[PDB]
Design goal:
The structure is a homodimer.
Chain A (H helix, E strand, L loop, with lengths): L2 E4 L6 E4 L25 H18 L6 H17 L6 H13 L14 E4 L6 H16 L7 E4 L11 E2 L9 E3 L5 E3 L4 H10 L13 E4 L6 E3 L8 E3 L14 E3 L3 E2 L3 E4 L2 E3 L4 E2 L2 E2 H10 L7 H7 L11 H19 L4 E2 L1 H19 L6 H4 L23 E3 L11
Parallel strand pairs in A: 3-4, 16-17
Antiparallel strand pairs in A: 1-2, 4-15, 5-8, 6-7, 8-9, 10-11, 12-15, 13-14, 13-18
Helix pairs in contact in A: 1-2, 6-8, 7-8
Bound molecules: protoporphyrin IX containing FE (2 copies), N~5~-{3-[(1-methylethyl)sulfanyl]propanimidoyl}-L-ornithine (2 copies), 5,6,7,8-tetrahydrobiopterin (H4B) (2 copies) and zinc ion.
One N~5~-{3-[(1-methylethyl)sulfanyl]propanimidoyl}-L-ornithine binds next to strand 15, strand 16 and helix 6 of chain A.
Chain lengths: ~400, ~400
Amino acid sequence: RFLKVKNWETDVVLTDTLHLKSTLETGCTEHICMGSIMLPTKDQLFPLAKEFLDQYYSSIKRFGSKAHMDRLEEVNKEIESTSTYQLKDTELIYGAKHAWRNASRCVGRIQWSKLQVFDARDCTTAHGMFNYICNHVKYATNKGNLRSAITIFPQRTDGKHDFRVWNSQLIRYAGYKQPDGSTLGDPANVQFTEICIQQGWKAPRGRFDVLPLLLQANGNDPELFQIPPELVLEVPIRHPKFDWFKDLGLKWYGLPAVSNMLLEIGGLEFSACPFSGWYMGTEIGVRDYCDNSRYNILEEVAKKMDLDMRKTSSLWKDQALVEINIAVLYSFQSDKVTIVDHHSATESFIKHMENEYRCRGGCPADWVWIVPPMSGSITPVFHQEMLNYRLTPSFEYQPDPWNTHVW
Amino acid sequence: RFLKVKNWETDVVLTDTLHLKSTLETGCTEHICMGSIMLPVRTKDQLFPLAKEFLDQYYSSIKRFGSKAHMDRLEEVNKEIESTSTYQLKDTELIYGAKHAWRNASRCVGRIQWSKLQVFDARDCTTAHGMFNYICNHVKYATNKGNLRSAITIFPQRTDGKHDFRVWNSQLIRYAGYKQPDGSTLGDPANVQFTEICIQQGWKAPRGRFDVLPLLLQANGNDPELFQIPPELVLEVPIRHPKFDWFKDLGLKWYGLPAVSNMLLEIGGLEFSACPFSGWYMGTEIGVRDYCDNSRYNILEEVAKKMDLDMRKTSSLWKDQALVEINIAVLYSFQSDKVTIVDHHSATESFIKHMENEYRCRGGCPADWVWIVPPMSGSITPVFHQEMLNYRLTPSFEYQPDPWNTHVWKG
Ligand code: HEM
Ligand code: HEM
Ligand SMILES: CC(C)SCCC(=N)NCCC[C@H](N)C(=O)O
Ligand SMILES: CC(C)SCCC(=N)NCCC[C@H](N)C(=O)O
Ligand SMILES: C[C@H](O)[C@H](O)[C@H]1CNc2nc(N)[nH]c(=O)c2N1
Ligand SMILES: C[C@H](O)[C@H](O)[C@H]1CNc2nc(N)[nH]c(=O)c2N1
Ligand SMILES: [Zn+2]
């Protein structure tokens, strides 16, 4: 029932009780651990609503008050009558912040209570969606002083009138298959790029082309819009010691904005809920630049550094990796665009875990995602035991719309 | 039922059926995953089923399932259990069992090598001096003057739990740690408590930064006895860097033979509480963990000082820079002295090939991602991108409590 987690570097032990409140399932069983797998009615809704309102009223220290009991009755009445219900602004803000608080894969949660929530439930068209999104982008970017934000579109109804952003992130680069057999741009986005073309986008067919938005309102066919270029803050990548680095022609965008997830609050489903914070440097320099299935630039960089690439044991990949990551952080810092390094980010997360343990009784965390993709054991999270479990409100994965949409 | 795992770099999808043979539990439930938790006498009643599954497995491995020889062995084991409360493994079954415990070790990246294990049968051992002799022979054989060979030595199994064979050392070869009155540590901080025990047992400590610890050996539930491994049997490597000439003056060395001595081997219900085993190092074990953990030798600052990196801000990645240089040094030093070592790129690439071959031939390969992914440069190794299923197969290696916590002192 009560569970201990130990830090093997500091010997600090913490007791988790919060997991007992957990509801959804992990994918694991007593016989098999699925810890490293990427993706493991009216009757249904009222318990979900109650569970949520109970935690909301508890949080404002008004549990079992007249105002508490009155809202539960009102929501039950609305469900019985409409088969759904509407959240108060206060409940929406609370729910969104707590979905982030509960995000077991997010290292940046120390920030969870400073989220600017943009209520877009009055939106009816793709043009309106585009307007809301440009405003989100400009607010969050803040000329490089980035601010966390989420924009929340109308909830699911009968399931044939879904709002969706087809893009995986608001800002991403195009990918094109070449007659060469190679890939131009970002190979992760080839399929989405093709969907854009088949829908009518004229592509510049370059290495770093900001994709258009493909927005779906009210279960209608999705529509294309180019984000005003002046709202997309980008960063040229240079190195503080290697003058040749700029010749590689690398750039990245300042605003990481996940747009393909589903926000669940009190049983209600927000299928369009783009949200954004700011980058941890490794996301760009380790993953986006060095994954073999991504920009895969390790080979080119190592060559310019004149390292011995004859044998893996020279650690040439490891040397180049570090340099690429130094350059990303240096470039963002020099252009005054918010970025956090993996040492600072994991250090703050340890402090956050301890806050959550004493103030809340625990913190769900997925070690496989929390530990940075480079220099794992020299960050304090490596040595920290974590318990992973699913609390609601939550951000969830959902299938890509092109597999699902009825045209 | 079939379970699928995907590699997100290659899109290669594999199907696991082997998990259906898993009996032991994980620590996880449908409501909690304990995937990152480090540590999450039998009755005749429980013993014969365990013996039976094992012998059915052994007899299938040799293509003799249901044979007269298989059936006669079952009956023989059965009768021996009801008569004596336990049983003895044939040499062939012992070898198969020890190899399979390695094959089944989900935290081990080196498993491509599982079928090449030299098994030394030490079940006729009776005394601590006997144990010492067996362990010296293991060390000499495994070391092989730098050309390391995997080996395990197997002492007599548990009987009533009052007559246990134990090696009190956590590894056969490790360096002493000494806590000083000013709170600093001399040597390896991981071994402070064990060093304190050795000293109290009468070990005369040299008190340097790399003093090889004595063996503390318990035979037959008796109080443990101290022994010094002959220095000439302990192969060591001075650490230097290919381009940095000041690196040698750090005064660093490490031993060549990594030999875990504190685990328990379970085969067919039988418990071998002293079963030291050894392979060879992956460089990051020494360069990342042993040298750079804050709770170990903690050399990152001193190395980064000497390199003249910008140390005032973590975002210069000074720690990451120093980390790579140290790890280059460890591999360079071992290679130069012709002592077996494997880099983390080579080892992970070989593990993926092993894992795929195991899916094809065995129907699965239990693997613990948290342990398999190296402690530096995670995502530039292929294992990071590989989904894995963790489950527990027998024969297996298991943790057991440290013996100073459980031993009944005789005096
Ligand atoms: C403010 C600074 C933030 C930092 C430094 C940060 C850090 C990170 C990192 C490094 C990841 C792993 C991403 C990957 O590997 O693809 C992540 C994932 C995630 N973050 Fe955060 N984050 C921040 C803000 C936010 C916000 C504002 C939200 C929601 C309101 C959020 C929710 C999530 C979720 C749900 C995931 C998992 C996404 C997935 O499974 O792909 N984060 N975060
Ligand atoms: C042949 C070369 C081998 C290599 C390169 C290798 C590599 C490794 C590494 C890097 C680890 C993680 C160690 C740590 O972080 O402390 C490990 C763990 C382990 N290995 Fe291997 N290994 C080898 C041979 C063996 C052998 C011969 C056995 C037994 C017969 C074995 C069984 C295990 C077990 C049980 C663990 C988990 C240890 C624990 O939980 O503390 N390995 N191996
Ligand atoms: C938006 C939430 C998921 S986390 C806040 C932003 C962020 N730090 N990253 C988002 C993921 C970006 C991706 N890894 C990339 O490298 O492009
Ligand atoms: C003996 C099995 C567990 S694996 C075969 C040897 C090995 N490669 N490592 C053993 C652990 C060494 C420890 N990490 C150290 O850094 O001293
Ligand atoms: C197979 C494995 O689960 C997968 O590669 C994971 C590992 N850890 C990760 N960690 C983060 N933060 N982001 C990721 O995309 C991944 N990928
Ligand atoms: C808490 C966490 O599980 C612990 O630090 C683990 C992480 N992964 C590891 N992986 C290996 N190979 N060896 C280790 O000691 C550890 N330590
Ligand atoms: Zn699990």
